Amino acid sequence: GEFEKLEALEQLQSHIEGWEGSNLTDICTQLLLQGTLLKISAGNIQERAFFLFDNLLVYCKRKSINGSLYIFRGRINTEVMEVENVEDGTADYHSNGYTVTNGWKIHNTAKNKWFVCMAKTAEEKQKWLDAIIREREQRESLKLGMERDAY
Numbered sequence: 001g002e003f004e005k006l007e008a009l010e011q012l013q014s015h016i017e018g019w020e021g022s023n024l025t026d027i028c029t030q031l032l033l034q035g036t037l038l039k040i041s042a043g044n045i046q047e048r049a050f051f052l053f054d055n056l057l058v059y060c061k062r063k064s065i066n067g068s069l070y071i072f073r074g075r076i077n078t079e080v081m082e083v084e085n086v087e088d089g090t091a092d093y094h095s096n097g098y099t100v101t102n103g104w105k106i107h108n109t110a111k112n113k114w115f116v117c118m119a120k121t122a123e124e125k126q127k128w129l130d131a132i133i134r135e136r137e138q139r140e141s142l143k144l145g146m147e148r149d150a151y
């Protein structure tokens with residue numbers, strides 16, 4: 001049930017070193033998807049481990065008894081995250097001029113920051129976009145349900 005999932009969140013966070021900000025068990029309840037993606041940001045191309053929870057996207061560097069597997073790099077409140085598809089073959093400054101396949105863009109609107117994600121396969125891209133949609137839908141459903149109760 002919910003409580004077992006919270007203990008799992010605390011354990012998951014314990015594998016991320018250099019965590020910044022509020023803890024997962026205070027703001028999240030579930031993991032929709034985790035996976036490795038290529039991230040291109042501010043001219044830099046870097047592979048990152050991404051984790052999409054309800055309300056939060058986290059990305060980490062993979063670490064090269066010690067429980068650390070990931071090094072915290074960033075987090076985005078999904079309420080201030082936008083996503084844009086990128087068509088295969090696009091090559092522009094967002095990808096440093098490299099050709100994008102299986103990619104998309106993420107907008108951190110709280111930082112006015114954009115970056116590109118690329119997956120290795122089309123099916124993996126589709127899993128990510130589907131998970132992003134599902135996280136947003138679940139969050140909106142819960143919010144609108146509460147607002148409709150209050151209104």
Ligand SMILES: O=P(O)(O)O[C@H]1[C@H](O)[C@@H](OP(=O)(O)O)[C@@H](OP(=O)(O)O)[C@@H](OP(=O)(O)O)[C@H]1O
Pocket residue numbers: 039041042044045046048059073074113115
């Ligand atoms: O490794 P260096 O040389 O420091 O380059 C960094 C990394 O690409 C960062 O990505 P990551 O955090 O995944 O390691 C980071 O921010 P983002 O997390 O915002 O992409 C920086 O962009 P900006 O600090 O935003 O300009 C960029 O300058």
